[PDB]
Design a protein around this ligand. Structure first.
Ligand SMILES: [Mg+2]
Ligand SMILES: [Mg+2]
Ligand SMILES: [Mg+2]
Ligand SMILES: [Mg+2]
Ligand SMILES: [Mg+2]
Ligand SMILES: [Mg+2]
Ligand SMILES: [Mg+2]
Ligand SMILES: [Mg+2]
Ligand SMILES: [Mg+2]
Ligand SMILES: [Mg+2]
Ligand SMILES: [Mg+2]
Ligand SMILES: [Mg+2]
Ligand SMILES: [Mg+2]
Ligand SMILES: [Mg+2]
Ligand SMILES: [Mg+2]
Ligand SMILES: [Mg+2]
Ligand SMILES: [Mg+2]
Ligand SMILES: [Mg+2]
Ligand SMILES: [Mg+2]
Ligand SMILES: [Mg+2]
Ligand SMILES: [Mg+2]
Ligand SMILES: [Mg+2]
Ligand SMILES: [Mg+2]
Ligand SMILES: [Mg+2]
Ligand SMILES: [Mg+2]
Ligand SMILES: [Mg+2]
Ligand SMILES: [Mg+2]
Ligand SMILES: [Mg+2]
Ligand SMILES: [Mg+2]
Ligand SMILES: [Mg+2]
Ligand SMILES: [Mg+2]
Ligand SMILES: [Mg+2]
Ligand SMILES: [Mg+2]
Ligand SMILES: [Mg+2]
Lengths: 233, 121, 52, 252
RNA sequence: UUGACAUUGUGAAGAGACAUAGUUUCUUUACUUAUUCAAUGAAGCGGAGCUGGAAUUCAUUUUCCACGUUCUAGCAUUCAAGGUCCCAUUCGGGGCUGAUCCGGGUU
RNA sequence: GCUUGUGACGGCCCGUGAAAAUCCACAGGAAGGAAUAGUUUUCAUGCCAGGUCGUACUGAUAACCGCAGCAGGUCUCCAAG
RNA sequence: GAUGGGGAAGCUCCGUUUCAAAGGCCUGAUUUUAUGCAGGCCACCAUCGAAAGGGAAUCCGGUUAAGAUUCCGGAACCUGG
């Protein structure tokens, strides 16, 4: 009001320099970004064969949460835990007269790809988690088919990194349980039930369904509005 | 939450942290000593007859001087090796690949006197 | 020109050493007259919006 | 035998074009937001001779929609444009000599210059002294527009493709005889090294299909096939007829 | 230069055979991500919405356009003045609005 | 008068007759700045400093190129009665 | 003519701002303390290439066997601090 004045600017072609705006839609990204984006796109413009695309169907955040919860009560030793264990049997046993059996039967999650595979083949695993990342997808593509055949219940889960956490590596590709403390035998069958329902039970039909096909949304609208008017007068 | 908000469309290389060198060992074990002290700079006097005259008439001291050395280094070294004050220092390259310095002392000093107390005449 | 006092590099009207007075006469006149007719256009076309 | 003149031109040694003095490349404005939604004003600040061009350029300056500053384009002056004139460029611009409009925005019979082949290529058709193109119709669905270029060729382009209203300046330049060798001499001195021209028929065989013989003569038909090969194609390449054009030309 | 094969994928219509079910093959005409060409200091793309308003309503909106600049050889920049909310009132300074929403396909 | 310089003009061109470093100016008004004392070095005067390489002479009927102290060849300025 | 690049068996060839995450200034922030971060700009993208092109500033008298707009005398001027 006072000796203050309202001047409003006219930003409308032919006058007033355009103002600063958010051009993030328009920035010229480093070639490497451009690639990792278009790779994701190209991946879905194509029709993707049933044996891939059976991924993409990831476990849901609820069920999963309950699985990382159980799988956590089963981590493998820490370096300290192991250092500590050894000196409790190095010291004992050899002198106390045991059989390297002042150590209890350990119950941990089984991991490492080549490991888990033999487990499945040997019908020893009881719940397998496959990642959904795994860039040479091939490392893992044959796993649903496998588990299916070995009558072993599996689930494809978001997080190779997240698998990694529960086993002390950066990444982990797969994580599996074969063993379980009776205080847990229970709600594992519960977990194997939803999981088998979302994957193994579905597999035979998931196998018949290609993927991809998806248009970009400049092209999607182009024919949601073409195939609107052309039929609907 | 959501995305950044760049107002420019140019993406520039992130300004990232540049650590200074902290070597696990040394360049050369021992620093080189001074490659151009005053004794290497001002080589010997020039005592040609026609050079001598500048000394009697011009209060000027003619020296053969290191090729590697400039008017600053000539000036100071004459100053230091001889306890004298220099006005200005003209130089030239001889046609046998040596450098001649026409050193003019200030008026407090008397190049003649000063030349036969370096020893020549 | 960098060894010379700033008076050698101007006259004392608006746009001193830059443009030439007569040229600044024109600049002022036209500026005025145009800013004026802006007010005219505004109120004329304003009235359009009230009887059309 | 030796490589003939017309194959040597291609390595551009002494044949690159003499360029030191030229004003800059003649070009429309970049096809930006302003020019394709509305229009933007500029002023011709100068119309000026360009070395070895036949038609004057017009320097036209504009404001920069996105920064405080001027941006100066270099146009080819259409006949009648003038210093101080205002120039309007845009879809929603008006039909006057000097402005630049998308061939979709202008009625049939419009007469324009420096027209683009694809929208945005900043102008490619009819630039030379005197020439222009004419709109001879539009076709809205799939927005193409149809013009007749100076050659006589009819062609269709995008209706978004821009052009500038009127004809290019400096016309008639070729009705006046060169009169002497010297004026062609200076003429090419500011283009490229293509003057004067030795008749192949005055050369020896090493030099040219036409060279040699005890009288000067082409010795075989001078109408060469399309499918001929380098060092072969001299004379009338691919000529579908030949001889003095009796009768009215003009494209039917 | 001309053909074949490879780079080569996706729909739809039409022809071609086990001899009038759809695997496959060709011909047309669509698609867009391979490949190709132009542009720009990848700046305003596509989709919705606001207001207008021509339009005539066959129930109430079924639509289609526009949706800040043209007498003048001026001037147009300090995240923008305005409005509004904070800091703890210092001078400084921040958010929002001014400049509508959504999708990050630079066109 | 002679040579050279420079000006205001005029003729010519389908010929219209470089570039960059660098210097100044203007538009702008972020900001900073006094009365018990501030602002000012584009006004004057004052202080210190300015490295490196070339620098002789010939430049021609003998110092250059023509096997040479070769009647050849080899870019230019000054110019008296 | 280097450089991200693209060809080439390769010696190397192409491109020179080109399909590149291409870089440095003004001072503010410091009163551990010396230069980390807090603003904003600027996106101009190597470099070599003229002793006749562009270009900061010096003159007169005297002096040598042989140098001099370079030394001596006197009197200026430019650039940086
Ligand atoms: Mg444990
Ligand atoms: Mg004495
Ligand atoms: Mg010297
Ligand atoms: Mg004055
Ligand atoms: Mg060229
Ligand atoms: Mg010639
Ligand atoms: Mg001829
Ligand atoms: Mg001829
Ligand atoms: Mg002959
Ligand atoms: Mg021949
Ligand atoms: Mg022949
Ligand atoms: Mg012949
Ligand atoms: Mg003949
Ligand atoms: Mg763009
Ligand atoms: Mg002369
Ligand atoms: Mg002229
Ligand atoms: Mg000036
Ligand atoms: Mg402020
Ligand atoms: Mg001063
Ligand atoms: Mg220095
Ligand atoms: Mg001399
Ligand atoms: Mg001689
Ligand atoms: Mg010899
Ligand atoms: Mg001779
Ligand atoms: Mg190269
Ligand atoms: Mg150089
Ligand atoms: Mg020079
Ligand atoms: Mg020079
Ligand atoms: Mg003298
Ligand atoms: Mg002497
Ligand atoms: Mg001499
Ligand atoms: Mg002196
Ligand atoms: Mg003095
Ligand atoms: Mg000074």
């Amino acid at each position: 009001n006072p000796l203050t004045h309202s001047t409003p600017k006219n930003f409308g072609i032919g006058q007033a320099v355009q103002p600063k705006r958010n051009l993030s839609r328009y920035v010229k990204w480093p070639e490497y970004v451009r690639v990792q984006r278009q790779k994701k796109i190209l991946s879905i413009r194509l029709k993707v064969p049933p044996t891939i695309a059976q991924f993409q169907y990831t476990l849901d955040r609820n069920t999963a949460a309950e699985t990382f919860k159980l799988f956590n009560k089963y981590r493998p030793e820490t370096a300290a835990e192991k250092k500590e264990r050894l000196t409790k049997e190095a010291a004992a046993v050899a002198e106390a007269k045991s059989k390297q059996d002042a150590s209890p039967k350990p119950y941990a999650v089984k991991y490492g790809l080549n490991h888990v595979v033999a487990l499945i083949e040997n019908k020893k695993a009881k719940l397998v988690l496959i990642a959904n990342d795994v860039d040479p997808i091939e490392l893992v593509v044959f796993l649903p088919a496998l588990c299916k055949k070995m009558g072993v219940p599996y689930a494809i889960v978001k997080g190779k990194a997240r698998l990694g956490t529960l086993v002390n590596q950066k990444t982990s590709a797969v994580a599996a349980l074969t063993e379980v403390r009776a205080e847990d035998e229970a709600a594992l069958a519960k977990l194997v039930s939803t999981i088998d329902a979302n994957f193994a039970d579905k597999y035979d039909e998931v196998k018949k369904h290609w993927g991809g096909g998806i248009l970009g949304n400049k092209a999607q609208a182009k024919m949601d509005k073409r195939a609107k008017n052309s039929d609907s007068a | 939450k959501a995305l950044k908000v760049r107002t420019s469309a140019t993406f520039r290389l992130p300004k990232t942290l540049k650590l200074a060198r902290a070597p696990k060992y040394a360049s050369k074990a021992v620093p080189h000593y001074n490659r151009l002290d005053s004794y290497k700079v001002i080589e010997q006097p020039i005592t040609s007859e026609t050079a001598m005259k500048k000394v009697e008439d011009g209060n000027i001291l003619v020296f053969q001087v290191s090729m590697k050395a400039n008017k600053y280094q000539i000036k100071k070294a004459v100053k230091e090796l001889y306890e004298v004050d220099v006005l200005k220092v003209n130089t030239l390259v001889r046609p046998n690949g040596t450098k001649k310095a026409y050193v003019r002392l200030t008026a407090d000093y008397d190049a003649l006197d000063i030349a036969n107390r370096i020893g020549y005449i | 020109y960098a060894t010379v006092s700033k008076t050698h590099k101007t006259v004392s009207r608006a746009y001193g050493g830059s443009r030439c007075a007569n040229c600044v006469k024109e600049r002022i006149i036209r500026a005025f007259l145009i800013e004026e007719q802006k007010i005219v256009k505004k109120v004329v076309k304003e009235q359009t919006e009230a009887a059309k | 035998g030796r490589v003939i003149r017309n194959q040597r031109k291609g390595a551009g040694s002494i044949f690159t074009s003499h360029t030191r003095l030229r004003q800059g490349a003649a070009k429309l404005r970049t096809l930006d937001y302003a020019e394709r939604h509305g229009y933007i004003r500029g002023i011709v600040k100068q119309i000026v001779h360009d070395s070895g061009r036949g038609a004057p350029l017009a320097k036209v300056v504009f404001r920069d929609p996105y920064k405080y500053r001027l941006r100066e384009e270099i146009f080819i002056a259409n006949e009648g444009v003038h210093t101080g004139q205002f120039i309007y460029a845009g879809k929603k611009a008006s039909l006057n000599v000097g402005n630049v409009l998308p061939l979709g925005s202008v009625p049939e019979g419009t007469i324009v210059s420096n027209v683009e082949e694809k929208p945005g290529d900043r102008g490619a058709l009819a630039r030379a002294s005197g020439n222009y193109v004419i709109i001879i119709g539009h076709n809205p669905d799939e927005n193409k527009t149809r013009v007749r270029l100076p050659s006589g060729a009819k062609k269709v382009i995008s209706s978004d493709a821009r052009g500038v209203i009127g004809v290019i300046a400096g016309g008639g330049r070729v009705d006046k005889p060169l009169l002497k060798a010297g004026r062609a001499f200076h003429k090419y001195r500011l283009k490229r090294n293509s003057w004067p021209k030795t008749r192949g028929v005055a050369m020896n065989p090493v030099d040219h299909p036409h060279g040699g013989g005890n009288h000067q003569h082409i010795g075989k038909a001078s109408t060469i096939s399309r499918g001929a090969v380098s060092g072969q194609k001299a004379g009338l390449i691919a000529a579908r007829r030949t001889g003095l054009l009796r009768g009215s030309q003009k494209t039917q």
